[PDB]
Design brief:
mainly alpha; Serum Albumin, Chain A, Domain 1; binds myristic acid; binds cobalt (II) ion; Albumin; cleavage on pair of basic residues; zinc; Serum_albumin/AFP/Afamin
């Protein structure tokens, strides 16, 4: 509907709850150093003003744009120059430039102390006694630490956090219930943040064409019944939405997503049969629902790709008159028939086909030259499939924890220069990827692995390039995204590496380990295993196994011993000397 007041407009569309939550997020992301109660006050002022406008749109300042009003509120902050320095100078600018000014002065890494997780009982009491304040303080705390995380997506995590507390605080064992859930949500939060940045970094580092190629592949998988023309229309729209979201303006990004959501829901008949329930959903949820929609089933009578792309005599002619449209159609056709492939695999095939057409269409006899291009696809398809069966079989033999340890040893041996915390975190996450994706049937394993492997390898690459230690990791991280995982898969053992000198404190343990959680204990042991491998990198899988066995016995025994701490000391020096002798 037409509206005199934009803020009254947004308010009625979102509802009061979502509005108040998003305003809090927006303020926390722009003013990261201001305390909670000042933010609560601002939220309440903006919210009370919104409701003035809902009641009377002819009221003072209700006609103003939400950008103008938002900037106006920031500029009423007293300590703005004293706290944010030159951000105060934004206030001397007219509104087109002012929001741009403010947006540039967001601090990606604010110097804020790590957010500590309270005990389960204190959280549950806080949740019980003061639900609104509990949940909003933390929304504030997370938003100010993540100024670029898309606010509506953060709102969606907050609701799952709320759900976890509702269930687990009434449980018999609260901590056994709650802490796994909070660990999952944190992982998904770190993953969502990873993807968002990775989209923008891909788009800038590699450009639209490659971005669109990725999108063609994925949308053809999701929507195999759609005609190429429609897919291409969605890709073009999807590419522009990303472009404007990567600039970081919330309203712009939200409006764009909701336009694309609106388009897709009006054209369900031309896109997918799986959009129905998504398209009934309210504003913020609809775009989010559509992003996570499941693959539609493929049409029945699908011709072979050979006809248009190998056997036609007009392959070169059709290619030459529009190369990207032709390659787009190739990718569209291949992808829609193969939801079981990774997008990157599909892009490798499309790039192979491109390379082949480029040379073969310049040969005296093209039709001959390019007649067996589909043979080049066999190894490309094989390579990821092999690793899947190979890792998921090993996962089934060992279980998550020991699978993780198998990885620790493998990757420490390959890149021993990486810091111990990084190797532990990456190997654990890689372990979970196996734990999650290996449970799927074959058809679903490769897309699963690609998605989760993408965020884990992003997190590694992000960590690494802030503190570089290995050129080989650098090369894998700075390569094309299509080649990133194969580059990492190709890393060999570093036979050059000179062992880390012995540090007795690293391999001394204490009685505290017995009472720690399964998670925390595993981490202390995994830390030690990395260091063991770094100190003895020529140790055989079987030699380490013997040390790992003796260590298990050491823990088990000293955790039943009366005097725990002298056990750990006395037996500990024994295990260490024996191990040193063993691994010589
Ligand atoms: C989107 C966030 C909304 C509210 C979140 C409430 C959760 C608070 C408990 C976790 C605090 C420490 C962070 C963590 O390790 O999980
Ligand atoms: C520890 C806070 C977890 C909150 C999860 C919601 C999404 C926020 C983005 C990523 C949060 C954790 C990032 C970090 O470890 O610094
Ligand atoms: C290039 C600066 C504007 C950033 C645009 C925001 C959208 C991307 C969200 C990424 C959040 C993670 C933070 C980071 O990795 O820098
Ligand atoms: C709604 C987003 C779908 C279209 C994605 C655009 C192409 C960018 C691909 C590069 C980033 C990969 C991250 C991921 O696996 O999600
Ligand atoms: C950086 C490599 C990205 C993948 C390259 C695949 C090449 C074949 C696809 C050509 C681009 C199609 C773009 C489109 O029409 O949407
Ligand atoms: C884009 C810069 C200013 C953003 C903050 C404006 C103040 C209201 C925020 C909440 C309402 C809009 C949220 C949305 O539609 O996604
Ligand atoms: C696979 C179907 C595509 C439809 C998704 C529409 C939403 C556009 C994505 C824009 C990304 C903004 C950042 C984010 O929400 O993570
Ligand atoms: C580290 C164990 C993860 C569990 C699954 C193994 C993944 C191996 C295949 C990787 C495929 C990703 C997509 C691709 O590069 O084509
Ligand atoms: C510091 C750790 C770097 C090494 C870990 C990255 C490698 C994981 C990607 C591939 C995992 C499944 C297939 C494979 O292991 O080749
Ligand atoms: C050569 C230096 C002395 C080594 C002392 C033993 C430390 C290695 C134990 C860590 C691995 C145990 C993990 C497990 O399988 O539970
Ligand atoms: Co309207
Ligand atoms: Co009660
Ligand atoms: Co625009
Ligand atoms: Co080198």
């Amino acid at each position: 509907d037409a509206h005199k007041s934009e803020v009254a407009h947004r308010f009625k569309d979102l509802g009061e709850e979502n509005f108040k939550a998003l305003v809090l997020i927006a303020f926390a992301q722009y003013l990261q150093q201001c305390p909670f109660e000042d933010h609560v006050k601002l939220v309440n002022e903006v919210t009370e003003f919104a409701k003035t406008c809902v009641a009377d749109e002819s009221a003072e300042n209700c006609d103003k744009s939400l950008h103008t009003l938002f900037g106006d509120k920031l500029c009423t902050v007293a300590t703005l120059r004293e706290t944010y320095g030159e951000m105060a100078d934004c206030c001397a600018k007219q509104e087109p430039e002012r929001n741009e000014c403010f947006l540039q002065h967001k601090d990606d890494n604010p110097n804020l102390p790590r957010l500590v997780r309270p005990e389960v009982d204190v959280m549950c009491t806080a949740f019980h006694d003061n639900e609104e304040t509990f949940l909003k303080k933390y929304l504030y705390e997370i938003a100010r630490r993540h100024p670029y995380f898309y606010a509506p997506e953060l709102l969606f995590f907050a609701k799952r956090y709320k759900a976890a507390f509702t269930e687990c605080c009434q449980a018999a064992d609260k901590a056994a219930c709650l802490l796994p859930k909070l660990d999952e949500l944190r992982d998904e939060g770190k993953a969502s943040s990873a993807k968002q940045r990775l989209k923008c970094a891909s788009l800038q580092k590699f450009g639209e064409r490659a971005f669109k190629a990725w999108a063609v592949a994925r949308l053809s998988q999701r929507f195999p019944k759609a005609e190429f023309a429609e897919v291409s229309k969605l890709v073009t729209d999807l590419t522009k939405v990303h472009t404007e979201c990567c600039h970081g303006d919330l309203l712009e990004c939200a409006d764009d997503r909701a336009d694309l959501a609106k388009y897709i829901c009006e054209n369900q008949d031309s896109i997918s049969s799986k959009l129905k329930e998504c398209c009934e959903k309210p504003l913020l949820e609809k775009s989010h629902c559509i992003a996570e929609v499941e693959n539609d089933e493929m049409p029945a009578d699908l011709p072979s790709l050979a006809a248009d792309f190998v056997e036609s005599k007009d392959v070169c002619k059709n290619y030459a008159e529009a190369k990207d449209v032709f390659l787009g159609m190739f990718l569209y056709e291949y992808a829609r028939r193969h939801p079981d492939y990774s997008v990157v695999l599909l892009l490798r095939l499309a790039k192979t086909y491109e390379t082949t057409l480029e040379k073969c269409c310049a040969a005296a006899d093209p039709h001959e030259c390019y007649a067996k291009v589909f043979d080049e696809f066999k190894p490309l398809v094989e390579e990821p499939q092999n690793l899947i069966k190979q890792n998921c079989e090993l996962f089934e033999q060992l279980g998550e924890y020991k699978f993780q340890n198998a990885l620790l040893v493998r990757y420490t041996k390959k890149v021993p220069q990486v810091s111990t915390p990084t190797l532990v975190e990456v190997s654990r996450n890689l372990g979970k990827v196996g734990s999650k994706c290996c449970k799927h049937p074959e058809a679903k394993r490769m897309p699963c692995a690609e998605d989760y492997l993408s965020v884990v390898l992003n997190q590694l690459c992000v960590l690494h390039e802030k503190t570089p230690v290995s050129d080989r990791v650098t090369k894998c991280c700075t390569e094309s995204l299509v080649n990133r995982r194969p580059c990492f898969s190709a890393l060999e053992v570093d036979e050059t590496y000179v062992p880390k000198e012995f540090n007795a404190e690293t391999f001394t343990f204490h009685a505290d380990i017995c009472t720690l959680s399964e998670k925390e204990r595993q981490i202390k042991k995994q830390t030690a295993l990395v260091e063991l491998v770094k100190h003895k990198p020529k140790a055989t899988k079987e030699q380490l196994k013997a040390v790992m066995d003796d260590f298990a016995a050491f823990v088990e025994k000293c955790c039943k011993a009366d005097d725990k701490e002298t056990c750990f000391a006395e037996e500990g020096k024994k295990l260490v000397a024996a191990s040193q002798a063993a691994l010589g």
